[PDB]
């Protein structure tokens, strides 16, 4: 019933562009929307986010998260390990690569979402959410070696799965961080499943 | 270590602007970033709210109430938590209850309110409160609920059982061209993982 008529480039950076979108509302009235897109999509999605489940015998299961300075936020954020999918990279392969670069952990794919939208009122940006298990007991995950690309500075924070939401709330109240909306959504559902 | 040095406006729309962010990296070196922000954030603790609406009725499984809308930036229909921007002077809780009634017809009860969480912190400074709300589906107020949609708002209500949310979203993605929101998908994954 609704569809795009035209897109007008407003401003194109190296990484991000601003468009005015003309679309038909369901009444047959023509309307405009200010929209953001990345310049980097070629891919099933722009990015991957990894839900990394660190499994060590006789330990609580942990979710592995990363803490980074985010220039748009002007502060530190707690997030699932994540990055843009390389030209000709599979979402699964991008997930294991990003997980290893950001955490040093070597993981196994459990499941992979279809492309899901990040902020569909603002942007066309999409990701694959890739569930990965990490055998914390294997030699390769003993002293995990993180491989940061140029300009990437990442701290690893592993939090117990069974208490994730209370642990995230404590970090926010203590360390003045911003928790990622997908991390918080996952944490909430772990509590609401009961 | 890291902080913002300057924010240079590149392009300002009515709703969305693009900025050149100069920040200090932790090596002590000056770097830049292309950052998106909204034009609409005054004193609000966040841009917006997203509502996790748990529809509770005697001798029914709990449902998660979702909305389906055309999203110009995506060029298609999206399944999301009910959501909108926080009005100047409005609490996150009032915005959540108001957006839920406007988009679904349901009159909710506040359960929980997150801190401000980041929508896509590599791209934008955009934040929301995630507000958990219960809906007493047994109350006559919530019997034949009519969406009161705003000018240019066209919303379909989709209520899915919490106990089968991920499978029901997967069946919707199979049967038509539609994107699930990353927060809905993250919430549905955690319900499975718990
Ligand atoms: O043009 C828009 N772009 C992004 N977000 C919006 C949010 C609104 F509420 C109205 C218009 C826009
Ligand atoms: O300046 C940037 N803005 C948004 N996203 C990015 C993603 C990159 F991988 C590198 C730079 C940027
Ligand atoms: Cl798992
Ligand atoms: Mg990353
Ligand atoms: Mg990277
Ligand atoms: Mg809305
Ligand atoms: Mg609305």
The stretches of chain A forming alpha helices (DSSP H) are 91-103, 164-175, 181-192
A chain contacts of residue B26, beta-carbon cutoff 8 Å? 69, 153
Comparing CA positions, the residue from A6, A72, A1 lying closest to residue A33 is: A6
Q: Flag if B188 and A189 touch (Cβ within 8 Å).
A: yes
| Phi, psi (degrees; rounded to nearest 5) at A23 | -140, 155
Q: Flag if B119 and A184 touch (Cβ within 8 Å).
A: no
Comparing CA positions, the residue from B187, B74, B178, B170 lying closest to residue B130 is: B187
Strand partners of residue B32? B22
| DSSP secondary structure, A158-189, as one string | EEEGGGHHHHHHHHHHHH--EEBHHHHHHHHH
Considering only CB atoms, A188 lies closest to which of B73, B127, B130, namely: B130
Considering only CB atoms, B80 lies closest to which of A120, A161, A189, namely: A120
The stretches of chain B forming alpha helices (DSSP H) are 92-104, 165-175, 182-193
Smallest CA–CA distance, residue B55 to chain A, in Å, is 13
- C-alpha A123/C-alpha A31 separation (Å) is 17
Technique of determination = X-ray
The position carrying tokens 């939208």 is: A117
Question: Per residue in A76-87, is it b (16+ CB within 10 Å) or e — as a string?
Answer: bbbbbbbbbbee
Comparing CA positions, the residue from B143, B144, B147, B191 lying closest to residue B169 is: B191
Give the tokens for residue A137: 């007991």
Q: Please report, in range form, the residues annotated as the binding site of B for Mg(2+).
A: 83, 99, 103, 153
CB of B15 closer than 6 A to ligand 1? yes
Q: How many domains does chain A have?
A: 1
Q: What is the resolution of this structure in A?
A: 1.8
Is residue B103 a contact partner of residue B155, using CB atoms and an 8 Å limit? yes
| Phi, psi (degrees; rounded to nearest 5) at B3 | -160, 165
The CA-based dihedral angle spanning residues A182, B126, B12, A18, taken in that order and rounded to the nearest 10 degrees: 0
Comparing CA positions, the residue from B180, B189, B193, B194 lying closest to residue B81 is: B180
Let me know how long chain B is: 194
Fill in the DSSP letter of residue B162: G
A chain contacts of residue B10, beta-carbon cutoff 8 Å? 11, 13
Q: CATH number of the domain at A149, please.
A: 3.90.79.10
DSSP-derived 3-state class of residue A103: helix
Give the residue numbers spanning the domain of A113: 1-194
């Amino acid at each position: 019933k609704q569809y795009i008529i035209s897109e007008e480039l407003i401003s194109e950076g190296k990484w991000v562009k601003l468009e005015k979108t003309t679309y038909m509302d369901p009444t047959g009235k023509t309307r405009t929307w200010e929209s953001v897109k990345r310049t980097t999509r070629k891919q099933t999605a722009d990015g991957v986010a990894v839900i990394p489940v660190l499994q060590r015998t006789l330990h609580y299961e942990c979710i592995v998260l990363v803490k980074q300075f985010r220039p748009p936020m002007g502060g530190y954020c707690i997030e699932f390990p994540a990055g843009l999918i390389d030209d000709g990279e599979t979402p699964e392969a991008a997930a294991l690569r990003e997980l290893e670069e950001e955490t040093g952990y070597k993981g196994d794919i459990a499941e992979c979402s279809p492309a899901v939208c990040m902020d569909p009122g603002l942007s066309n940006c999409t990701i694959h959410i890739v569930t990965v298990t990490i055998n914390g007991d294997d030699a390769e995950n003993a002293r995990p070696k993180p491989k940061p690309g140029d300009g990437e500075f990442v701290e690893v924070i592993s939090l117990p799965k069974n208490d994730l939401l209370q642990r995230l709330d404590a970090l926010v109240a203590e360390e003045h961080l911003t928790v990622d909306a997908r991390v918080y959504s996952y944490a909430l559902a772990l509590k609401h499943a009961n």
